[PDB]
Design a protein around this ligand. Structure first.
Ligand SMILES: CCCCCCCC/C=C\CCCCCCCC(=O)O[C@@H](COC(=O)CCCCCCCCCCCCCCC)COP(=O)([O-])OCC[N+](C)(C)C
Ligand SMILES: CCCCCCCC/C=C\CCCCCCCC(=O)O[C@@H](COC(=O)CCCCCCCCCCCCCCC)COP(=O)([O-])OCC[N+](C)(C)C
Lengths: 48, 48
């Protein structure tokens, strides 16, 4: 809210998590899903 | 052993040589992929 005693406590706390890397660990925990098998997965090409 | 003599038949001899040049060249370039068979790749490789 408009002036809170919990902004600066979290502002320091978010900076701790990306220093430890846990904001990157939780990033790779949810956004990483199936690899979405790429366009370079030809494996066969009968010329048509 | 039979070769075209008139220019009326050289272009038929000319284009058909260029046609069978690209057919055999596209055949050999693709058949390297199909004899080098990419093996069985069941889409689980580790615990990750
Ligand atoms: C009668 C047969 C059966 C009936 C069937 C009908 C067949 C009729 C045949 C053709 C009519 C049109 C067919 C469909 C249209 C494609 C053509 C075209 O659009 O332009 C093409 C021109 O490409 C060329 O120029 C090809 C000719 C090369 C010159 C050959 C000279 C050989 C002489 C040397 C001899 C040396 C002798 C040696 C001894 C001295 C390129 O354009 P495109 O990319 O193809 O167009 C795609 C559209 N797009 C651009 C948006 C993607
Ligand atoms: C190994 C020794 C053999 C010698 C033969 C040499 C023959 C002459 C060789 C090359 C001449 C043409 C060179 C340009 C081709 C580039 C691709 C292209 O443009 O396609 C485009 C349309 O297609 C065209 O606009 C080309 C139309 C002519 C095609 C027929 C040429 C063969 C001649 C027949 C006579 C057979 C032989 C005669 C004797 C019997 C498709 O669109 P694009 O690809 O997205 O556009 C990229 C354009 N770019 C790459 C230019 C930027």
């Amino acid at each position: 809210p408009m002036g809170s005693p919990y902004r600066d406590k979290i502002t320091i706390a978010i900076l701790q998590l990306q220093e430890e890397g846990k904001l990157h660990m939780m990033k790779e925990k949810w956004w990483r899903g199936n690899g979405c098998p790429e366009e370079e997965s030809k494996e066969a090409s009968a010329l048509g | 052993e039979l070769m075209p003599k008139a220019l009326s038949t050289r272009i038929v001899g000319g284009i058909w040589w260029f046609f069978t040049l690209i057919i055999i060249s596209s055949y050999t370039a693709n058949l390297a992929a199909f004899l080098t068979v990419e093996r069985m790749e069941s889409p689980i490789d580790s615990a990750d």
